[PDB]
């Protein structure tokens, strides 16, 4: 359990120290806890094939406060950090090319936030007048039932 300023040092320790040879990046994720002042919890999962052990590292972030990128240490973190940005909006400072990876090319919003609705804000159809695929507001023939 660490702070954002402490990501790069601790990860260097977890990568280079002889007793803690966590060399494989497994996953980078974020979790929204909107009751916390720092809403997003950025989670890291690491594996050591040397010692056959796993470790986890957690930091925190906001919609506007960034986190240091560990691409300088683990190249595999690139796509994961991109996904975390695309889904949650967490900005990773130091990232070479941080852009959406999963969502549509003009998607407005970060889906896995708890305030983002399941069905989103927009939908698509084919307009015969314009001869184009048009993005329009949402209307469902059957409304979602939460239960």
């Amino acid at each position: 359990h660490v702070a954002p300023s402490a990501v790069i040092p601790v990860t260097t320790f977890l990568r280079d120290n002889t007793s803690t040879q966590y060399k494989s990046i497994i996953d980078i994720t974020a979790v929204d806890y909107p009751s916390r002042e720092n809403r997003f919890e950025v989670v890291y999962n690491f594996l050591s094939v040397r010692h056959n052990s796993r470790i986890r590292l957690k930091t925190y972030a906001t919609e506007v406060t960034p986190v240091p990128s560990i691409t300088c240490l683990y190249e595999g973190a690139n796509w994961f950090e991109r996904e975390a940005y695309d889904m949650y909006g967490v900005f990773f400072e130091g990232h070479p090319d941080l852009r959406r990876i999963m969502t549509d090319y003009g998607f407005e919003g970060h889906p896995l936030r708890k305030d983002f609705p399941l069905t989103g804000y927009t939908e698509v159809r084919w307009d015969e007048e314009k001869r184009r695929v048009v993005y329009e507001p949402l209307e469902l023939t059957q409304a979602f039932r939460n239960f």
């Binding site: 060399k23 494989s24 990046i25 497994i26 996953d27 994720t29 979790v31 989670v43 999962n45 594996l47 094939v49 056959n52 796993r54 986890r56 683990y74 190249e75 595999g76 690139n78 796509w79 994961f80 996904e83 889904m87 959406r100 990876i101 999963m102 969502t103 549509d104 889906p111 896995l112 983002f116 399941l118 939460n146």
Partner: protein
């Protein structure tokens, strides 16, 4: 200045087995930069799971890597069982192991014989898909679905094995080896196969770790790591199998690894068909699993529990877990968070193809375009898992 030319390998095209937009930049024949654009099969699985009970959420995992269904639901079941702190019975463990290796056979029959087809060998595809049909029949006999079984669930298995299935699985196993051998006669010692595979897609062990690769991609570089041996989960600690590991990090070594994995899966299936125990196939705690119907229709507690499990669901303790399996694609994992409720708070799937397609840029630089096809084929990329 070396001006580069941008070709879209194709949002719709044959080599991608699924839907991929690989924006490559070439200087002549050589790739210098690649930009795999994904999300064309992003369906919002990980947000939908947040609105579903743990039972309602399980068919999300059959549809992530859709050639290896039972292993995905196996890892989700393992995660939810680790949170629930329940023990699957021995028969359920043996069933899960046997069918996980049947699933591995199916995945490798798709992967090797689609890699072959994309490299140009058309005939192994059509040979292997009949064996796929023969195993799909066992899937259908146990679950009722050819592909999406929804069979391995949290707590074990949905239904016991029907009568006369082990005999037929043994009948298939008596002949599958010759099918493997006939595929190897075409591919293994062939000149053109070796030309298209030897010293293509080379990745070092250090970079294989740094990029997050696992499975054959990590074992071809020389690292002996397999989660079934290093962290056994269901019954792999009660069955004898060897792990293939290769040098030289090439695609030929990955192909040989996958064929050795075929043969070891067959070994495991033999042992499970010989040593299948008796007993229940799901946990005998009706607060987690449905009771039998003849008790639900005669016992009051059984019916109450049926009602609640099928309406509200079982409530999982609060916490979080990352657990993983040696899926046929590599290390597949699920990071679940429980809020004490019947529905997950967060479910992230660590798909093995995400990391591999991310490493495509490092692996395919300096190669010609015919070699990119082989690299995509040895990564064994299904895009439901890449995009989730």
């Amino acid at each position: 200045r070396i001006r580069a030319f941008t070709i879209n390998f194709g949002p719709q095209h044959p080599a991608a087995h699924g839907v991929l937009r690989l924006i490559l930049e070439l200087s002549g024949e050589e790739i210098i930069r690649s930009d795999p654009h994904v999300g064309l099969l992003h369906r919002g699985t990980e947000k939908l799971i947040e609105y579903k009970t743990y039972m309602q959420a399980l068919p999300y995992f059959d549809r992530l890597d859709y050639v290896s269904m039972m292993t995905n639901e196996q890892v989700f079941s393992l995660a939810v069982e680790k949170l629930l702190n329940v023990e699957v019975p021995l028969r359920g463990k043996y069933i899960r192991t046997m069918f996980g290796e049947i699933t591995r056979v199916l995945n490798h029959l798709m992967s090797v014989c689609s890699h072959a087809m994309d490299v140009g060998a058309l005939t192994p595809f059509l040979w292997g898909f009949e064996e796929r049909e023969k195993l799909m029949e066992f899937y259908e006999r146990v679950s009722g679905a050819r592909l999406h079984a929804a069979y391995v669930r949290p707590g074990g298995v949905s239904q016991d094995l029907p009568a006369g299935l082990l005999d037929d699985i043994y009948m298939w196993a008596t002949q599958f080896g010759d099918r493997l051998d006939e595929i190897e006669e075409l591919l293994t010692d062939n000149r053109i196969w070796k030309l298209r595979t030897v010293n293509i897609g080379t990745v070092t062990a250090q970079d294989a770790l740094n990029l997050g690769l696992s499975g054959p991609m990590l074992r071809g570089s020389g690292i002996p790591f397999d989660i079934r041996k290093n962290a056994p989960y269901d019954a792999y600690d009660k069955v004898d199998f060897d792990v293939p590991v290769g040098m030289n990090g090439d695609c030929y070594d990955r192909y040989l690894i996958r064929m050795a994995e075929f043969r070891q899966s067959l070994r495991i299936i033999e042992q499970c068909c010989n040593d299948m125990p008796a007993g229940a196939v799901k946990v005998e705690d009706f607060k987690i699993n449905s009771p039998p119907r003849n008790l639900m229709k005669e016992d009051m507690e059984a019916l109450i529990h049926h009602f609640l499990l099928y309406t509200k669901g079982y409530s999982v303790p609060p916490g979080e877990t990352y657990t993983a399996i040696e899926a046929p694609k590599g290390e597949m994992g699920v990071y679940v968070v429980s809020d004490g409720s019947e529905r997950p708070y967060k479910c992230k799937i660590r798909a093995p193809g995400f990391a591999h397609l991310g490493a495509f840029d490092h692996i395919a630089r300096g190669h010609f375009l015919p070699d990119a096809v082989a690299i995509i084929g040895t990564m064994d990329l299904v895009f439901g898992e890449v995009d989730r």
